[PDB]
Ligand binder design. Structure first.
Ligand SMILES: CCC[C@@H](CO)NC(=O)c1ccc(OCc2c(-c3ccc(C)nc3)noc2C)nc1
Ligand SMILES: CCC[C@@H](CO)NC(=O)c1ccc(OCc2c(-c3ccc(C)nc3)noc2C)nc1
Ligand SMILES: CCC[C@@H](CO)NC(=O)c1ccc(OCc2c(-c3ccc(C)nc3)noc2C)nc1
Ligand SMILES: CCC[C@@H](CO)NC(=O)c1ccc(OCc2c(-c3ccc(C)nc3)noc2C)nc1
Ligand SMILES: CCC[C@@H](CO)NC(=O)c1ccc(OCc2c(-c3ccc(C)nc3)noc2C)nc1
Ligand SMILES: *[C@@H]1O[C@H](CO)[C@@H](O)[C@H](O)[C@H]1NC(C)=O
Ligand SMILES: *[C@@H]1O[C@H](CO)[C@@H](O)[C@H](O)[C@H]1NC(C)=O
Ligand SMILES: *[C@@H]1O[C@H](CO)[C@@H](O)[C@H](O)[C@H]1NC(C)=O
Ligand SMILES: *[C@@H]1O[C@H](CO)[C@@H](O)[C@H](O)[C@H]1NC(C)=O
Ligand SMILES: *[C@@H]1O[C@H](CO)[C@@H](O)[C@H](O)[C@H]1NC(C)=O
Lengths: 336, 336, 336, 336, 336
């Protein structure tokens, strides 16, 4: 009984040219694309790339594959894929894309009586995501994903998303788990580009990323905040204890310097100032300013001791207030 | 005499279509899966992936391979594997799976008279293991391993473990050796998933991991514990030695700060607090608090020396008791 | 109707030898090359290599492919590419070049009635860019890209850019985005080389790179500048405070030493002095010189206190002026 | 004249089934294995793997290859290897094995009149070497290398070393050069294993490794030894110099702490104590104990100065003696 | 007209056995090898390997390829290479060699009427270069490159360099550019080796490398030299300033300790002392010795102040002289 299916396959392959698209010189081929993101890979700020794994699916029409039989569907595998025509889809921004092979090549091929074809493929894309780290770490990123035909212009092959946007792109709940980002949502789009070879249709999908704060708070912000508090303790000490107050100022200044170097080692080498850098610089001024205050006080502690005492007492109140006020402005500005 | 076997192989291949599963349109194919873990690979917390090497085996039925001969078994190699039908099994969570080739492709194919087939394969799977580092390092992890068909729905191919759970999955004694984890045990499971293409059967296996403590004790906990003890020595010193007591407080505070930075460099960049972080913070307060005590004492050592002496004497007893009490609560809470 | 195209393809392949170039022993083949840079990859100073992704296109003439039909163009794919003759172009300086495969091999093949052929290919080139870091970081680099034939001498195959230089090489606006470089412009060139096998034609394209400053200012220059200012504070302190002034000098000298080590860790291991190194050395002298001044002052503070006071007062003015003057000369020299 | 050899090859291939082993269902095939280690690769303690390059050779018997001709030997290449039957040998513990291809596949195939076959292959094996770092760095390791058949049980194929053990395994003098290990010698062995598929024969070869000390002496031991000596200098100083003696104790304690962290960064993350760790801990006690002695002395220098002087004088002698005695016990225990 | 060439190719392939070398059982094949180094890759001391890219060329004789035609040369490509016999050359010391593919396999095949064949190939070799770092960094290295036949003994195939040594090996001027080495020159050689399979001919080429100093001077030597000078400043200070002189000695000793650790991190883990290590040790003694001098002086400053002053004055002169004298001996010894 199974032999009937074998005859059908041979008939379709008879007089079949895999090098010619269906409806050549007669109409325009239409392709429907749907995507499912199995898991969203890590985002590397240093390399400006993000990995992703998807089940890419493409649907089109082919009159040459019409067949008649008891079954309306013919599940198959990659064996027959190489014997027919498939679109030459590729990713413009994909630096390096590799497929999955074991245990068996992850591909499917389904054919119906009307000729409709469903071809699906599993891929891993190491695309590139340009970013503007001006409000880092309070930054929102829009990592795109562009793909389209390579050799078939817009006058022969057209890519259109199937059904609505939500059905076109699906993201698994467990996949959207990044250590330092939130997957707020997804969007889709289309456009045309004109080149020497002709016009092409481009399908674009964007993923909205919102960085989650909390790692940098425990790593960079808190050490800077506590370092400033340490310096202010020198004010409460007596003036005559020159050595004691000197240690506080010198050690704190060096501590701030090394934090800036270590903090930016992980951050990408960007030739502009970030929000974190401004925060570090302000904290650097406080510790440095406190050291200057001690030097000025110790330089006039003999001629006019009266003014020195007033300055030292005043500093115990002025400096904490300014630091507290600055934090409210800084956090409010970037968090609202 | 050997020529008899050659004729048998040709007969089976005659009229054989590798693109059609056995019993198509007549019944539902059943596949029995058994696994053996040669060695459990390292677990990378930063990349949330774990490597594993297994001898994957699949058994099914094929009536087209029936044969009659003196021998009930026909040991073979990968040469005949490509000439017949095999399931398109794949791992849903496998980021990158590669097979082993040298010296000869590690595959076997055995056929019996009844048509039963035993196909085995050697694989290395770089799967992903999501984790919740809320009780780190006292954390228990459940790294899964999911696999199933790609193109054949649940109505055509069904995966069922053979015999009991213990026989289905076997782990070598030498393989279960990880530098920073314990392989407490294994479990298996099954479930169905409905998608656009149809329903599929999913076979799930979980490995229980219990982190072994002792590396972090020698790396993070002890330096923090000894640092606190160092600070308390300042209390036993005389008040007039302002410079001496200052060095203890300043150096210890900086030492704690760098330990936090270095400790989390190896730990994954997670935007939430761990148990280790709370322990570090508490130890940071003690050293910082001791420095504040000295400043307060030195600020009133002239007007009311009587109260200063009482505070210094009391601090020698209060602080050690609190630190000792805290450790009992902390360790007891997470170890019981 | 489509069957007409199938017959045409078979006719061209009849009596076609892919191992023989067109017009063998009759004339000289001419090839026109055009390039489009999709994205300019990162530049690794340590490895002296730069990555790049391009759409390489080659045009030539083949009389054997003449055909007559309703359509003047025959869009195709990589399937027919292997069945005809293509040039053996290669990159002389390309350390490791790999192509892109998924989803379908990124190649196109177009044929016209006259025999003109348009073959395009997508490549990623990890070429090598020698550099002279004598004015680092104020350095301008000229990273080339050389390619040509491997087996066909200049007497058989000649490479010539099509149209003008601007049309020959095109760089996408978004692609020319490097974290630490500016793509000032592009240039092209040609030349011949004589070897044992014979003369060959070499096509050379150069990319002008101008390093963008600002990362090193926040990383190396500022810490050195602030460190010098810290040392000068010791002058304003009193001579009798021997311990206080000692701490400033000792700590600052060590701080400068570690900055030099850390700064050059990222920089390539080059056995010659850079502009940054000279700046560090000068700053090292100031902090070291200040320490020497204190030692000299403290060594004569008993016999002739009168001269010691004059030296200390003078140092408060001389040193800042010299440091300010040096910066103007240094920055002006390399920035103009 | 050469045409005679061509006819011989065709005759052997006639009626040859590469899927059936020689003497099937008649006897048991016997295979002789010999190995030559071109170079022993680096040993990675962190990854518990060792690389090795060998010229694997296998000899067996095949009656179907009998031939008659003037020459008793037929040197050949990999071209004929794929056309005959070869054993499916594989390495059980080989995580990832890759062969060498350029310039030409490194394989040989020699056939004699009697049917004896000599098949050799070049391989690189990234095997795994479990270790017990309890006596680190004075540890001796036994890295094995296991290989055997995959599909052919012990009842069909048997592996036996040829000639004696010394001839079976050969190691080049230049190859046995490791930066931090000594190749004391080699050993071989055999055993059987019973599994579901049946019994198999396992050939095991062990390499004895003796770690060479001297890198850790210059890296970890000496800094700890010199640090202890530095602390003892504080004893010779006067009691009234509270600040001076404080610096020695505080700085040394911190120095020991960082050495422990840095030392174990290269060492694998093992959750148990090593010999080096105990040595560090003992040295940590000395520096810490010296600081405690100063605090105790300074705490009674007023009420009973007489006892303080005796303690300080005694400490100058007791501490050096204990440190010297400890080293003799420690080194003698692990070196003998 | 071109059809004549097509007929010639078919005639040569007729009755051609690619598995049999020319002149089998009649004479000894002779192969001429010439090399051109496009670029000399980086040398990794840690991994004891060096990368290199070459255009390997081999010339031999084949009577079966004789042809008659108007053209004395037949330029071709890799298409015909697989259809004839080529030597199985390989590199004995090549850990991992890979070829270049894009755009087209970099291979050429030229045939003359007499049968002479010119086969060339482009390769990248990651060979191993053992080194003896006893005089590091003033060390001269001899990195070899060995290659020869795999299956053809010395009685069948012999490798001989063509023309003189200079013509045999050619190095491009731009290629011989290493960041930390000088390519002084090249040499060639030959030898025979006897093994179980028989005698073989080995072709050896050595590259002379002379390390260029200047990176270590700016990285390791200068910080050590300046650190010693810093310690000597303590001598010029007054004895009563116990705290001041203590800081100089303690900080400098720790600074030297960390330089040794950091310096050897990049250096390979070798279990023996280098020249740099001895220089560091000597500098360590000076700073340590100066600290001992202060302790001895402060220990007798009460009983016999007269002798203390003489020691302090003398130390200001003795120590600088010894350090200067040592440098002359050290540099002269290794630089001459
Ligand atoms: C992600 C959007 C990228 C857009 C806008 O920035 N780039 C362009 O504007 C553009 C792209 C290609 C091009 O042609 C290069 C070429 C091709 C060729 C091949 C296949 C395809 C599909 N397109 C072109 N064949 O030869 C040559 C030479 N010219 C301009
Ligand atoms: C590890 C459990 C993962 C579960 C639950 O989280 N994911 C889903 O719920 C799910 C999976 C696939 C899917 O379809 C995508 C698809 C397929 C296709 C191909 C092969 C297979 C076997 N399944 C689907 N072909 O085209 C498209 C488009 N939709 C939803
Ligand atoms: C980027 C410019 C590089 C220039 C200038 O520095 N190099 C040379 O001057 C040069 C290059 C090759 C050569 O021949 C080596 C050779 C070849 C062979 C193969 C294919 C081609 C295309 N050329 C040569 N076949 O065998 C052997 C031996 N000799 C000198
Ligand atoms: C290095 C020594 C390792 C020893 C002792 O620790 N391991 C075992 O005891 C062991 C090994 C395999 C096994 O079977 C798994 C299997 C196989 C299969 C395939 C090929 C071969 C050659 N053996 C088994 N085919 O399907 C399944 C399922 N069971 C137990
Ligand atoms: C770079 C110089 C290396 C020299 C000197 O140190 N080594 C030796 O002395 C030596 C090399 C091979 C050998 O044989 C191993 C072997 C081979 C085989 C295959 C192909 C070739 C060309 N040679 C041998 N086939 O099976 C087996 C077993 N024995 C000793
Ligand atoms: C792209 O081209 C198609 C041609 O049919 C056209 O319908 C569509 O509107 C174009 N899109 C844009 C954004 O211009
Ligand atoms: C999955 O589907 C099969 C269909 O036969 C059914 O027997 C089984 O109970 C289902 N499993 C679950 C968990 O629903
Ligand atoms: C290279 O050779 C060609 C041969 O036609 C010649 O026309 C051209 O001028 C040569 N180029 C140079 C730079 O010599
Ligand atoms: C392994 O099996 C073979 C079967 O012939 C037997 O001769 C041999 O003694 C066995 N080895 C061991 C260690 O039991
Ligand atoms: C190597 O063998 C050949 C055999 O012809 C011989 O001529 C040559 O002298 C030998 N070389 C050495 C170094 O012995």
């Amino acid at each position: 009984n199974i032999t009937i299916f074998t005859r059908i396959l041979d008939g379709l392959l008879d007089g079949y040219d895999n090098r010619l698209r269906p409806g050549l010189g007669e109409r325009i081929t239409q392709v429907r694309t749907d995507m499912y993101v199995n898991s969203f890979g890590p985002v590397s700020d240093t390399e400006m790339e993000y990995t992703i794994d998807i089940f890419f699916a493409q649907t089109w029409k082919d009159e040459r594959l019409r067949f008649k039989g008891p079954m309306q569907r013919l599940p198959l595998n990659n064996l027959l894929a190489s014997k027919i025509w498939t679109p030459d889809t590729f990713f413009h921004n994909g630096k390096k894309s590799f497929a999955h092979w074991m245990t068996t090549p992850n591909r499917m091929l389904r054919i119906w009586n009307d000729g409709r074809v469903l071809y699906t493929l599993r891929l891993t894309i190491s695309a590139e995501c340009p970013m503007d780290l001006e409000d880092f770490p309070m930054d929102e990123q829009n990592c795109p994903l562009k793909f389209g035909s390579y050799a078939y212009p817009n006058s022969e092959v057209v890519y259109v998303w199937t059904n609505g946007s939500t059905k076109s792109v699906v993201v698994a709940e467990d996949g959207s788990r990044l250590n330092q980002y939130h997957l707020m949502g997804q969007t889709v789009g289309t456009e045309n580009i004109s080149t020497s070879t002709g016009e092409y249709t481009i399908m674009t999908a964007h993923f909205h990323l919102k960085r989650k704060i909390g790692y940098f708070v425990i790593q960079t912000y808190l050490p800077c905040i506590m370092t400033v508090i340490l310096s202010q303790v020198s004010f409460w000490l007596n003036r005559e204890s020159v050595a004691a107050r000197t240690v506080f100022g010198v050690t704190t200044v060096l501590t701030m310097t090394t934090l800036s170097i270590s903090a930016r080692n992980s951050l990408p080498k960007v030739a502009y100032a970030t929000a974190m850098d401004w925060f570090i610089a302000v904290c650097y001024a406080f510790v440095f300013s406190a050291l200057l205050e001690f030097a000025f006080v110790n330089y006039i502690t003999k001629s006019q001791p009266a003014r020195a005492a007033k300055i030292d007492k005043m500093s115990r109140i002025v400096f904490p207030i300014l630091f507290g006020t600055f934090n409210l402005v800084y956090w409010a500005t970037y968090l609202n």
